[PDB]
Design a protein around this ligand. Structure first.
Ligand SMILES: Nc1nc2c(ncn2[C@@H]2O[C@H](COP(=O)(O)OP(=O)(O)O)[C@@H](O)[C@H]2O)c(=O)[nH]1
Lengths: 607, 186, 136, 97, 50, 430
């Protein structure tokens, strides 16, 4: 039995042109951290693919809605895997092995019978001609400079375009001979770096993208260039990508944040629009209106040509979620820690509520406090900050708390004092005061960073999580009684079982080890994959069941009474990092390590 | 603005060698033009404010109203290249009694009359670069027999090229003046 | 206009008003200079400061001298028994007009209209799934 | 000094590409010039498909024949704007040929 | 003028020649979509000459 | 404040500006449109040193480009990052010098110097607090070494108290590009030391060689070279535009590095730098930096740094690390190289740390020290100049352009003597 998923929250625009509305629509492909998921528009149903090891490097769709293809990037020794996937069958068809790390991108000819791939900055940017029907090595040749992308001609598949780093070379391929032809375009008084390719439908002329922000003109008929671009204006970081409208009007979005269109005539922007983030994907829907736009900061926006009023569909966490938390006895709203910022999200519907962000710092263990006071976090610099829920402004600053940054923070029932985790073998307590903020921690001695902190209902004692294991329970009143449940591993998140002296803890080794206040073990769970380490655990209000999430893609929830599992998690990628249970306990929510947010309907027969 | 600050020898209110020669200063223009160009007479960069209807073009020392640039510096002094044409300048002075006055010098006036709010005074400009030392100490006592406290505002009108504006605070010879203050002959 | 608004698929009223707006050659010509060349086809119209000059295309100049206006000049060269014999549509298609703009797909165009409005309304949200299929 | 200084100015004007250059003579420059070093001899644009940009925002409803403002001559109905000629400027500053 | 620069003039100052044509207009048959405001000034007249 | 002007001249000084300027914009993330889109607050705190403020919020560099022939000028703008330059600043001629020192300093430059020179005061007067003038030019280019060198003399004539920066690339004897390489250098050197407070020597032979032995890049390009030229250059003021534990402006580096007014020549070094192949393998360690920046091959000139005795050393550490780790690392090498370290002045090594490292790197250090080893170079060029002099070769051009061999004769007399005097202290002992 698996665990039902009721919704998926997450998106990555890192790989360019990830978004494409399927020819005839009703289907769209957006790359997750490592897996492909296809979602329906009219209906909320979706299909899942998970046959891949590393993250995606590029995604593209052939015309006429046939099977898809793409590439990814693996370690230097290994070879990147090719991503041929069918359509109308949802069944893997072919698999290929070549290339060292990553290939820039893929794009099929007018017909679905040819395929070509261009290797990354490694492998001398190997370009090979592949066969759609079956795997073969038809022919290939190298290139001196790096070519960052390739798109085939709308017609006459024999000729293609590649915009190399230092020159735009027109390559010619002939079936009769295995060779590949190369002709060098001439740009006297030109030194521009180029990014994108745009071949005019007629195939005579075409346009490409440049790092300066100016669009050149080059017809396939001859290498000579014709124009300059928007005179007296630049987009400040070049051109992310280019698209061609039925009238020929070029629509361009500056990565600095801008949406601009240049018509095929002396190019003066008729209208302009800037959307948050950096544009990454430009795709045209059916009947040629209201294109789809996705930024580099993982933002998806919808626009109307001829008057560019950006409209937001939804965006997702930047990457690699850090933690989750819930309001005391409340589950309507839940927040999280990001790599640099914080956010506030709704539970019933995943529409964002509000946010708190820090310029260039990463936080840990974001938690909410009773009475709406408040959003508190200690940052990489070690400073401790608290913010009001209604608005993104801070309440008090506790600076220089830790040398290597804060690592843990929780809630006291009366919260008259704070409990945190120290990376340099330290645990510091703070008897907060409204007038001023002071600390009276004993400044204890510990070998490794404290990965967790717990407070019992009477809030006298406390249990400490460690990297060197060293699970030292602190009396938290006299700051003494350093007795730790023993284990020679790297522990992780630790929580208190409800109304019980038993502490359900996990360590580096693949085992859910049980320990009591008297060095007693109920059972050694033996919950470990081949190379998967359980990183998060918890306990329900009633000691009936507990849901666990290991380093594996699976969500692994077990019963506390006996080592027998009920259901599990599937469809996850990355290294899940935390698993909490909402106060209602109607669902368990965990996010992907790569920036994926998922919510699962907990089994009915556990309430 | 120049308050609770050490004022002993000089205070270069307006000076012609800087990235933004007039940052505190505010300008309003109607039909003249404002621009800086190297001077033929002296190899230096000097500000110029050219226009007509001198009563319209000018530049204000304090940025905007509601604040005073009050200065305890007793003397005033100021440099210009004469353009053989209309020129005017006026300053605001606070008296011992809680009243506000102003003394004006005119290039195109022949009669002056001491009068409670203003006392317009004519000027004569010498050919070539000229330096004029405004007393500002004897004038205040002569106008109404009320001493000086601080300068409230400083204004300069159009049709005059100014190289530097500063408060000498005392009769100083060219030798006494530093190299920056001293105007080296072409 | 009559059979013109139907020619370009535009409303009857707008065309007439559109005619007046372009008409005011005087206002753009009353001012000094601003020479113009209004050709729009067979004949060209030119203007200097105030003088006028123009030419007519020979090809059109040739056919008027094609010795075939004799049946054009007189009003009663046709049989005259066909006036109610022929439906106005029949000659309508063959006319030089109604063919200026290509005939796009009529029911196919109805197709994309049912979809693009479909994604807009239902894409307000993208989280609810009710179809897990993790394995596939 | 005098000559040889603007020669440094022609290219500067020629400097900007902008899909254009200043050869010092572009239009309306005297009658003409010699076609070569000696006297001349005896025997010597892209536009879009205008029918494409379509219906960005305006809905596709049409009013049709069914109409009639008769009887609804209320004081709030809009009034057709009359025509007004543009301001004349003459050519005091235009080029003279 | 070039018979093409002019239309850049009429659609420029709306108050000078105000009317229905300063904005894009709907199309009779549902199939066709309204064009760009300047465009309708090009589609209409081109036919007229024919 | 503490600002200096950027002056790039000659064919060998142009592209570096076409590259050096690019690097700075990347250093401050200045986007191609001249509009700030950086990430850190410290990015802009001191942008006036190299970038000025213009109307509309855009930035324009305060550099004056020049040359005797416009063709090289007609190339910089077409290159990436050319939209920052102000169109007015360009001043160009019509004919060129043709690698003829006399042409760039006697006949042609004299008339054209003012127009290009004139813009100096307009700019130099524009500075809020002038710090100095930095010149990037090559003695191997007849038009450059003729026109470029004179501007220094006129420039110096008005601000004697200022301290001046010069970056001249002398064509190494290993590779020669213009048969007249010997001539233009010798006369240039005579004037060169006449005004320049500071100076840096660079030889192409040492330039590309490091690429072949350390970088091992497959196909070197001049653009790759330019990135090499500035990188060491970029460290000159990196500590001048941002705070540090011990702030190091341009002058103090001058104060700590020139024992005598006349012996004012240094060699430099830039790290870290390695081939693409091992980009991941090594570990960035201060000990790794100290040895390499003390590695002989890391020097920017063909002269062997072990062929002489080090007058002094200067350390410009980029990135953060413990202060104590700075001192111990430096002292040990001096002890281990006492035979290579003079005994006149103890602790002749200057140590300063920059808190803002280069983009994409964590720890960086450029080496700068006065090394007597320069006595070889002045021997080789003069011998090349001397040996061909005896045949009266190529001598009629300068003689026919108003200059006399006596001017030729005087140059070496002030050249050979400086050679010995620099090496005279080498044999001296306390
Ligand atoms: N790094 C680099 N050096 C160059 C380049 N072009 C020329 N040089 C150097 O410049 C020297 C020649 O200078 P030259 O052109 O004669 O100077 P000029 O006569 O004053 O213009 C040669 O020794 C080259 O090493 C380039 O593109 N990159």
């Amino acid at each position: 039995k698996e665990l039902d998923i009721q919704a998926v929250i997450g998106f990555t625009g890192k790989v360019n042109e990830g978004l494409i509305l399927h020819p005839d629509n009703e289907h769209l492909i957006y790359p997750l951290g490592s897996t492909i998921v296809v979602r329906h528009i009219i209906s909320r149903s979706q299909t899942f693919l998970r046959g891949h090891d590393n993250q995606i490097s590029i995604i593209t769709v052939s015309k006429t809605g046939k099977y898809i293809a793409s590439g990814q990037k693996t370690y230097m020794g290994f070879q990147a895997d090719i991503i041929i996937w069918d359509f109308e069958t949802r069944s893997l068809m072919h698999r290929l092995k070549l290339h060292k790390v990553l290939i820039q991108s893929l794009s099929f000819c007018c017909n679905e019978q040819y395929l070509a791939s261009l290797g990354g900055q490694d492998d001398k940017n190997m370009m090979i001609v592949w066969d759609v029907e079956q795997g073969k090595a038809l022919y290939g040749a190298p290139n001196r400079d790096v070519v960052n992308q390739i798109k085939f001609f709308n017609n006459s598949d024999d000729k293609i375009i590649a915009v190399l780093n230092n020159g735009v070379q027109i390559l010619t391929i002939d079936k009769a001979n295995k060779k590949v032809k190369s002709l060098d375009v001439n740009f006297g008084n030109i030194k521009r770096q180029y990014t994108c390719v745009a071949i005019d439908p007629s195939d005579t002329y075409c346009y490409c993208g440049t790092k300066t922000g100016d669009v050149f003109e080059i017809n396939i008929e001859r290498a000579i260039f014709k124009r300059l671009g928007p005179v007296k204006k630049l987009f400040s970081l070049g051109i992310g990508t280019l698209g061609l409208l039925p009238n020929g009007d070029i629509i361009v979005g500056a990565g600095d944040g801008t949406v601009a269109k240049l018509s095929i005539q002396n190019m003066q922007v008729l209208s302009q629009s800037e959307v948050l983030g950096a544009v990454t994907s430009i795709s045209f829907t059916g009947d040629y209106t209201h294109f789809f736009c996705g930024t580099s900061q993982s933002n998806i926006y919808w626009i109307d040509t001829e008057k560019l009023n950006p409209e937001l569909r939804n965006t997702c966490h930047y990457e690699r979620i850090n933690d989750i938390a819930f309001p005391y006895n409340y589950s309507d709203v839940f927040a999280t820690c990001s790599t640099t910022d914080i956010r506030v999200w709704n539970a019933r519907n995943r529409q964002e509520l509000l946010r708190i962000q820090v310029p260039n710092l990463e936080c840990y263990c974001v938690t909410f406090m009773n009475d709406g006071k408040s959003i508190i976090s200690g940052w990489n610099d070690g400073k401790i900050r608290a913010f009001l829920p209604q608005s993104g402004k801070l309440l008090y600053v506790i600076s220089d708390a830790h040398i290597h940054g804060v690592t843990a923070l929780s809630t006291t029932s009366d919260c008259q004092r704070i409990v945190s985790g120290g990376s340099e073998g330290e645990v510091r307590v703070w008897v907060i005061n409204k007038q001023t903020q002071v600390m009276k921690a004993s400044m204890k001695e510990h070998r490794g960073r404290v990965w967790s902190i717990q407070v019992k209902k009477n809030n006298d004692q406390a249990v400490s999580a460690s990297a060197d294991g060293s699970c030292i329970i602190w009396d938290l009143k006299t700051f003494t009684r350093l007795m730790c449940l023993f284990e020679s591993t790297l522990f992780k998140q630790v929580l208190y079982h409800p109304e019980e002296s038993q502490l359900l803890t996990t360590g580096s080794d693949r085992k859910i080890t049980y320990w009591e206040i008297y060095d007693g073990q109920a059972i050694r769970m033996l919950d470990g994959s081949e190379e998967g380490e359980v990183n998060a655990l918890s306990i329900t209000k009633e000691g009936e069941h507990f849901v666990s999430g290991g380093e594996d893609k699976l969500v692994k929830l077990w019963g506390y009474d006996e080592g027998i599992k009920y259901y599990s998690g599937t469809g996850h990628s990355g290294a899940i990092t935390r698993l909490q249970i909402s106060p209602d306990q109607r669902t368990v929510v965990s996010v992907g390590a790569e920036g994926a947010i998922f919510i699962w309907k907990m089994p009915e027969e556990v309430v | 603005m120049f308050k609770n600050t050490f004022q002993s020898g000089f205070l270069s209110i307006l000076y012609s060698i800087g990235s933004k020669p007039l940052q505190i200063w505010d300008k309003s223009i109607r039909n003249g033009h404002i621009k800086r160009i190297t001077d033929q007479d002296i190899l230096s960069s000097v500000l110029e404010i050219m226009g007509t209807n001198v009563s319209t073009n000018y530049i204000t020392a304090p940025a905007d109203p509601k604040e005073t640039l009050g200065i305890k510096l007793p003397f005033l002094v100021m440099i210009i290249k004469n353009l053989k044409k209309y020129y005017t300048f006026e300053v605001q002075v606070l008296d011992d009694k809680n009243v506000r006055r102003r003394f004006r010098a005119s290039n195109y006036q022949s009669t002056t009359r001491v009068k409670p709010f203003i006392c317009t005074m004519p000027m004569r400009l010498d050919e070539g670069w000229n330096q004029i030392q405004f007393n500002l100490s004897d004038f205040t006592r002569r106008a109404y027999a009320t001493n000086y406290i601080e300068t409230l505002r400083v204004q300069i009108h159009a049709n005059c090229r100014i190289r530097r504006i500063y408060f000498s605070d005392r009769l100083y010879s060219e030798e006494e003046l530093p190299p920056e203050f001293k105007l080296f002959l072409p | 206009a009559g059979p013109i608004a139907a020619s370009c698929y535009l409303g009857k009223d707008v065309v007439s008003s559109a005619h007046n707006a372009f008409i005011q050659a005087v206002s753009d010509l009353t001012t000094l200079g601003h020479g113009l060349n209004i050709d729009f086809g067979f004949v060209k119209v030119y203007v200097q400061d105030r003088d006028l000059r123009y030419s007519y295309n020979q090809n059109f100049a040739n056919t008027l001298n094609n010795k075939n206006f004799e049946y054009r000049l007189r009003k009663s060269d046709t049989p005259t028994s066909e006036h109610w014999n022929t439906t106005y549509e029949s000659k309508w298609a063959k006319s030089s007009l109604n063919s200026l703009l290509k005939r796009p797909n009529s029911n196919q165009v109805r197709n994309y209209y049912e979809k693009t409005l479909a994604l807009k309304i239902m894409s307000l949200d993208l989280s609810t799934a009710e179809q897990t299929n993790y394995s596939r | 000094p005098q000559q040889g200084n603007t020669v440094g100015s022609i290219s500067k004007r020629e400097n900007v590409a902008s899909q254009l250059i200043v050869e010092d003579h572009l239009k309306n420059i005297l009658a003409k010039s010699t076609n070569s070093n000696y006297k001349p001899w005896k025997i010597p644009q892209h536009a879009p498909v205008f029918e494409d940009s379509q219906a960005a925002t305006v809905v596709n409803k049409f009013q049709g024949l069914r109409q009639g403002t008769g009887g609804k001559t209320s004081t709030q109905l809009p009034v057709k704007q009359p025509f007004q000629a543009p301001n004349p400027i003459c050519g005091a500053f235009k080029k003279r040929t | 003028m070039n018979l093409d620069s002019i239309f850049e003039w009429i659609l420029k100052q709306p108050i000078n020649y105000p009317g229905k044509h300063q904005d894009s207009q709907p199309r009779t048959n549902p199939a066709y979509k309204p064009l760009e405001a300047k465009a309708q000034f090009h589609i209409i007249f081109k036919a007229t000459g024919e | 404040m503490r600002e200096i002007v950027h002056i790039q001249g000659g064919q060998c000084g142009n592209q570096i500006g076409a590259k050096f300027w690019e690097v700075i914009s990347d250093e401050h993330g200045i986007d191609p449109t001249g509009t700030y889109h950086g990430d850190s607050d410290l990015q802009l705190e001191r942008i006036n040193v190299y970038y000025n403020e213009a109307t509309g919020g855009r930035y324009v560099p305060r550099a004056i480009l020049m040359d005797l022939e416009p063709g090289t000028m007609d190339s910089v703008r077409a290159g990436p990052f050319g939209q920052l330059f102000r169109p007015d600043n360009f001043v160009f001629g019509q004919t060129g010098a043709g690698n003829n020192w006399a042409k760039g300093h006697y006949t042609e430059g004299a008339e054209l110097i003012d127009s290009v020179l004139d813009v100096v005061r307009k700019e130099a007067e524009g500075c809020d607090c002038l710090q100095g003038f930095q010149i990037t030019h090559s003695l191997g280019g007849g038009t450059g070494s003729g026109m470029g060198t004179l501007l220094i003399s006129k420039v110096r004539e008005e601000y004697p108290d200022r301290i001046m920066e010069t970056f001249s690339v002398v064509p190494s004897p290993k590779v020669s590009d213009t048969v007249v390489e010997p001539y233009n250098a010798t006369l240039s050197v005579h004037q060169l030391v006449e005004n320049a407070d500071e100076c840096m020597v660079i030889d192409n032979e040492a330039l590309y060689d490091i690429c072949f032995r350390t970088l091992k890049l497959t196909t070197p390009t001049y653009g790759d070279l330019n990135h090499l030229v500035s990188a060491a250059m970029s460290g000159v003021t990196c500590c001048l535009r941002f705070p540090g534990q011990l702030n190091s402006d341009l002058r103090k580096l001058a104060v700590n590095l020139i024992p005598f007014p006349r012996l004012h020549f240094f060699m430099i070094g830039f790290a870290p730098l390695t081939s693409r192949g091992s980009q991941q393998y090594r570990a960035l360690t201060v000990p790794e930096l100290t040895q390499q920046m003390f590695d002989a091959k890391n020097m920017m000139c063909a002269a062997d740094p072990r062929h002489g005795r080090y007058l002094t050393a200067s350390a410009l550490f980029r990135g953060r690390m413990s202060t104590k780790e700075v001192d111990e690392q430096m002292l040990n090498v001096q002890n281990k190289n006492s035979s290579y370290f003079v005994e006149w002045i103890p602790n002749n090594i200057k140590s300063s740390i920059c808190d803002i490292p280069p983009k994409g790197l964590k720890m960086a250090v450029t080496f700068v020290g006065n090394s007597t080893a320069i006595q070889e170079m002045f021997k080789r060029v003069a011998e090349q100049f001397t040996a061909m002099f005896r045949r009266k070769a190529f001598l009629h051009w300068y003689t026919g352009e108003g200059m006399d061999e006596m001017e030729f004769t005087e140059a070496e007399s002030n050249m050979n003597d400086l050679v010995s005097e620099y090496q005279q202290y080498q044999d001296a002992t306390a």
